[PDB]
Amino acid sequence: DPSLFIQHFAEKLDLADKKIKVVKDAVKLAQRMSKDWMFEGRRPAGIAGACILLACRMNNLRRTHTEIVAVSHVAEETLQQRLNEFKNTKAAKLSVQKFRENDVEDGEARPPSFVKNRKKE
DNA sequence: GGAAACGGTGCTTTCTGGTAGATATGGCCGCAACCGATAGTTTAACGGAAACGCAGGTGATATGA
């Protein structure tokens, strides 16, 4: 599961005393994105890297793509693809701000896997 | 009624030469024993065959990387 990867990445990055908060927020991000269907058939190191990036953002701490792709085996373009995908989810730009909002429900999930075919038709 | 004198020769005896076995000493011939050597296992440990697993000549279905 992604929990092991985020723990190892946080341990190897050694960001600050905030490691626990970063890992806990990354767990919540990974769980929410999994409930949004954005994890089936996809790389564990990619979800872990993106969840840490989002957790760091929620914790107001800055990091370069080069450090998160040093611990994770996935390429920078994969992190950016997943970041943009997260940003297109239901109410993302309306909930990605401060105060850690309680919105966790799935609603209707519309991943690229079938939506690319819906666009092609 | 018989024993004493002594002639007959049957039966026996050593001096000896014969028969011929015996062996202290001797010289060959070859058995009993040792130190010697050739051949033996099966494995140190890794050199070997047979035993062993992934590639490359197409194709190419998915949706992520």
Curated annotation (Swiss-Prot):
The lineage of its organism: Eukaryota, Fungi, Dikarya, Ascomycota, Saccharomycotina. The gene is BRF1. This is Transcription factor IIIB 70 kDa subunit. It comes from the Eukaryota. TFIIIB comprises the TATA-binding protein (TBP), the B-related factor (BRF) and the B' component (TFC5). General activator of RNA polymerase III transcription. Interacts with TBP. Binds to Pol III subunit C34 and to the TAU135 component of TFIIIC. It is found in: Nucleus. Present with 4330 molecules/cell in log phase SD medium. The chain holds residues 177 to 297 of 596 of the full protein. Sequence repeats lie at residues 9-88. Belongs to the TFIIB family.
